[PDB]
Design a protein around this ligand. Structure first.
Ligand SMILES: CC[C@H]1/C=C/C=C/C[C@@H](C)[C@H](O)[C@@](C)(O)C(=O)[C@@H](C)[C@H](O)[C@@H](C)C(=O)[C@@H](C)[C@H](O)[C@@H](C)/C=C/C(=O)O[C@@H]2[C@H](C)[C@H](CC1)O[C@@]1(O[C@@H](C[C@@H](C)O)[C@@H](C)CC1=O)[C@H]2C
Ligand SMILES: CC[C@H]1/C=C/C=C/C[C@@H](C)[C@H](O)[C@@](C)(O)C(=O)[C@@H](C)[C@H](O)[C@@H](C)C(=O)[C@@H](C)[C@H](O)[C@@H](C)/C=C/C(=O)O[C@@H]2[C@H](C)[C@H](CC1)O[C@@]1(O[C@@H](C[C@@H](C)O)[C@@H](C)CC1=O)[C@H]2C
Ligand SMILES: CC[C@H]1/C=C/C=C/C[C@@H](C)[C@H](O)[C@@](C)(O)C(=O)[C@@H](C)[C@H](O)[C@@H](C)C(=O)[C@@H](C)[C@H](O)[C@@H](C)/C=C/C(=O)O[C@@H]2[C@H](C)[C@H](CC1)O[C@@]1(O[C@@H](C[C@@H](C)O)[C@@H](C)CC1=O)[C@H]2C
Ligand SMILES: CC[C@H]1/C=C/C=C/C[C@@H](C)[C@H](O)[C@@](C)(O)C(=O)[C@@H](C)[C@H](O)[C@@H](C)C(=O)[C@@H](C)[C@H](O)[C@@H](C)/C=C/C(=O)O[C@@H]2[C@H](C)[C@H](CC1)O[C@@]1(O[C@@H](C[C@@H](C)O)[C@@H](C)CC1=O)[C@H]2C
Ligand SMILES: CC[C@H]1/C=C/C=C/C[C@@H](C)[C@H](O)[C@@](C)(O)C(=O)[C@@H](C)[C@H](O)[C@@H](C)C(=O)[C@@H](C)[C@H](O)[C@@H](C)/C=C/C(=O)O[C@@H]2[C@H](C)[C@H](CC1)O[C@@]1(O[C@@H](C[C@@H](C)O)[C@@H](C)CC1=O)[C@H]2C
Ligand SMILES: CC[C@H]1/C=C/C=C/C[C@@H](C)[C@H](O)[C@@](C)(O)C(=O)[C@@H](C)[C@H](O)[C@@H](C)C(=O)[C@@H](C)[C@H](O)[C@@H](C)/C=C/C(=O)O[C@@H]2[C@H](C)[C@H](CC1)O[C@@]1(O[C@@H](C[C@@H](C)O)[C@@H](C)CC1=O)[C@H]2C
Ligand SMILES: CC[C@H]1/C=C/C=C/C[C@@H](C)[C@H](O)[C@@](C)(O)C(=O)[C@@H](C)[C@H](O)[C@@H](C)C(=O)[C@@H](C)[C@H](O)[C@@H](C)/C=C/C(=O)O[C@@H]2[C@H](C)[C@H](CC1)O[C@@]1(O[C@@H](C[C@@H](C)O)[C@@H](C)CC1=O)[C@H]2C
Ligand SMILES: CC[C@H]1/C=C/C=C/C[C@@H](C)[C@H](O)[C@@](C)(O)C(=O)[C@@H](C)[C@H](O)[C@@H](C)C(=O)[C@@H](C)[C@H](O)[C@@H](C)/C=C/C(=O)O[C@@H]2[C@H](C)[C@H](CC1)O[C@@]1(O[C@@H](C[C@@H](C)O)[C@@H](C)CC1=O)[C@H]2C
Lengths: 75, 75, 74, 74, 74, 74, 74, 74, 75, 75
């Protein structure tokens, strides 16, 4: 009981480390969005859906970390 | 219940590591906003809302980290 | 049995660290896609499938992490 | 009592690691300000408030880490 | 032998960490492929096999991590 | 209380890790200062105070780490 | 006996972390090859052997990590 | 006393991790110096003292790590 | 003498982490050699020895790591 | 005795982690050396002493890590 619960909680905190990837990744995408629109304003409608897609896929990796975090805390 | 409490506190500490991602990310987004507007002043009103969106989505990964940290501390 | 179960749950958490690589990586690919299309719009149809391939291969590395995490969890 | 107290101190230390993001991120913002102003001095008044907003938001992530640190310490 | 099995599981979790390098690496390669084809479309057939090669070699390093991870798990 | 004092010392060691962000950040700022003055010498008096400011803010994050580190040591 | 055996398995896992350098480094080399060949296709024959030398030396660092890993395992 | 002494020696080792920041940082500064002088030789006397200032401030962050390491060691 | 042996083995593992530095570093040096020669073919004979020197000095940091690893394993 | 020796050896392995900084740093310097000479071959004699200095200072940080490593192992 003690040792198992404690491990679940240490694990849950550790599980949030991977989120740093999405934090950096989402930003890399929006940076490219911003620089690409600055260089070529007319391409805006083409690249904005590309940035939304990029962000969502990168964010999905953080979600998977958070899922493990929640499984440990609750499941 | 000593070992479990101890684990909650170490876990809360560990849970904040992931915030370094939003720290760097938010900065990356604003860096691009600054560089983009330097190269092309007239694009400001178009890219500023993109930088705000980018900020918010990168920040969210930090929010999740802190949420787990506070669930371990208090929840 | 407690100690082993404890080790399984610690390990499962540690197994997610590697996902930061796919997070950053997937983004590096889409960043290139966006910059490449901004500089040269006519190249879009050629590079978009290259970005899909690149994203998928990068993500897979993180899915192998998740796989190990689930093996330990369950 | 003593094991819990020990954990608080270890946790307080671990809690400062994330401050490295703010340290790097603040620098990233000022780097762009400097490079932006060098390439186009006349844009200074426009980008300075952007740089202020940027580093303030980046620094805040570090203060959140420090918030947990001081919660664990006191 | 609770201690030994425990060590195998934690060690299996740790072994996946190195996969992040493959995640970032693979992305670095496809990013360059995309940027290179954008700047010079006619170079596509020459650089695409180079990109496959770079992906494979970078991926190999992920394979070795997963290999040690599976050896500890089974 | 061997356990508690132990925790203070390990925790003091961990608290210095975040200093690496200040180490890299400060460098990022001076790098940009140097690159900016190289490209545009006449901008020196305008960007130099910006660089001092960026250094100070990035350094502050290191200060907070050392602060938690000293609080645990004493 | 069992504590030492446990340590070997944990150590074997930790030992694969450094493979992330080779994973990223191999990619860095191929990225430069691709970008170099895109900007100047006629330099291909000159830079390819350089890229081979570069990634071989970078990959070797990862094999040294793996050498320790397998020493600890067997 | 053993446990505390053990914690001092573990902590001292951990206290050196932060030095990686000054290692990378000092290099970032000199890289800028070299690139700035290559692009604009006549700027050398102006930027060289800026590089000295930047290197010294970056290094100091790593010396504060070493300071903590020595406090724990002795 | 179980705890000490155990510590030698974990320490040896930890000692290899630092090799990721030479891995990335060596690559950085060769990347620059490749990009430099692409931009200016005629500089090859001048920069190749610089790349070799650069390789050797970055590699040395890995050598020291592995040296400590082997001292813990065997010495 | 046991616990102290074991800690010294775990510490020594941990002490080599910072070396990754010099591994990457030395390389960053030689990269700039190579790209700067490629762009402007005539500046070679001015920047090469700058790269030697940069390398030595960056390498000094790795030395400090290795010093701690050796103090733990032997001192
Ligand atoms: C891989 C699936 C991702 C979905 C991508 C969807 C892309 C489509 C586009 C059009 C989006 O929906 C977009 C840009 O409109 C969008 O994000 C919407 C929903 C959002 O309201 C936008 C407009 C917005 O203004 C943001 C910045 C909002 O102000 C802020 C409160 C939300 C931040 C956030 O991170 O949301 C998460 C994210 C959408 C993520 C996105 C997940 O979802 C949330 O986070 C997940 C778990 C995280 C860790 O993945 C969970 C808590 C529930 C969520 O709803 C949520 C919590
Ligand atoms: C989806 C997540 C994020 C949502 C962002 C939405 C952005 C839209 C734009 C228009 C914002 O409203 C914006 C740019 O105006 C803005 O940030 C405002 C509110 C802000 O006051 C700006 C201008 C400001 O001056 C900042 C720097 C302020 O001085 C400083 C004290 C706050 C920093 C900070 O990080 O706050 C958090 C952040 C808004 C974050 C941002 C959350 O929210 C707070 O922090 C979160 C936790 C963090 C870790 O996300 C939580 C405690 C609730 C918060 O109020 C808050 C506490
Ligand atoms: C997003 C939140 C951060 C604030 C951002 C504010 C942005 C707006 C602009 C105007 C700034 O305040 C800015 C750039 O002017 C600025 O930093 C001012 C305050 C500063 O005096 C300038 C002139 C300066 O040169 C600084 C770097 C000075 O050399 C040095 C002695 C102070 C450094 C410092 O980092 O202050 C802290 C930090 C802003 C932090 C970070 C807060 O705040 C301080 O510490 C906190 C508490 C600790 C726990 O953070 C509290 C005492 C208030 C503080 O003064 C303080 C302790
Ligand atoms: C160092 C050996 C690597 C081999 C590289 C070979 C390169 C040659 C090129 C032409 C490939 O065959 C290529 C690009 O066509 C290719 O990968 C094909 C087979 C692949 O189906 C492509 C087209 C594809 O669409 C991908 C995105 C596919 O849809 C997706 C489900 C697979 C992702 C993936 O990561 O697969 C791994 C990868 C090929 C890796 C790559 C291994 O293999 C797999 O993963 C490895 C383990 C990982 C961690 O290395 C192991 C389980 C064996 C695998 O099946 C597999 C599981
Ligand atoms: C957020 C507050 C920071 C203040 C920034 C102020 C910026 C304004 C500008 C004009 C400075 O005063 C500046 C550039 O002139 C300056 O630093 C002067 C005082 C300094 O002597 C310069 C010229 C110098 O030559 C340096 C390289 C000096 O030779 C070297 C021995 C000092 C390195 C150093 O890191 O000092 C720390 C730093 C100023 C830091 C900077 C703190 O302060 C010291 O270190 C901090 C702790 C660290 C981890 O922040 C603490 C012990 C107090 C310090 O004395 C000090 C210890
Ligand atoms: C610096 C040492 C590394 C070698 C570098 C060599 C550079 C020279 C060039 C010619 C290469 O060999 C190169 C690019 O041609 C190449 O990789 C060849 C071998 C490969 O067949 C090419 C065509 C290829 O597409 C690969 C990526 C293929 O798709 C895939 C199935 C094999 C991947 C692989 O990474 O092989 C390993 C790796 C080179 C490693 C890394 C060794 O070697 C292999 O594994 C080792 C043992 C394990 C523990 O490393 C042993 C069995 C020999 C191997 O084949 C092997 C297992
Ligand atoms: C100061 C440290 C380094 C010294 C470098 C000197 C460089 C000068 C130039 C001229 C070299 O001789 C150079 C470029 O020709 C060269 O590396 C040769 C020897 C090498 O065979 C090259 C061409 C080669 O083909 C490599 C990729 C070879 O195929 C592969 C099997 C070896 C990889 C490797 O990393 O070896 C180590 C490296 C030379 C390193 C490099 C050491 O040495 C070896 O590894 C070290 C340990 C590592 C971690 O440093 C130790 C076991 C002794 C070694 O022989 C060796 C084992
Ligand atoms: C901060 C002081 C540094 C000194 C910098 C000196 C700069 C001046 C220039 C001219 C150099 O001396 C230089 C470039 O000529 C040079 O390095 C010489 C000595 C070297 O022989 C060069 C020419 C060379 O060919 C190298 C690549 C050689 O083949 C290879 C075997 C040495 C690798 C190496 O890392 O040496 C270390 C380094 C000089 C370092 C350099 C330390 O010294 C050694 O490593 C230190 C500890 C490390 C961790 O700092 C210790 C083991 C003893 C050493 O001699 C040594 C072990």
């Amino acid at each position: 009981m003690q040792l198992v619960l404690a491990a679940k909680y240490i694990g849950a905190g550790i599980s949030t480390i991977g989120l740093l990837g999405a934090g950096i990744g989402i930003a890399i995408v929006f940076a490219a969005l911003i620089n690409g629109v600055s260089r070529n304003p007319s391409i805006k409608d083409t690249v904005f859906p590309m940035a939304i897609l990029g962000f969502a896929l990168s964010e999905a990796t953080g979600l998977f970390c958070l899922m493990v975090s929640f499984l440990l805390l609750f499941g």
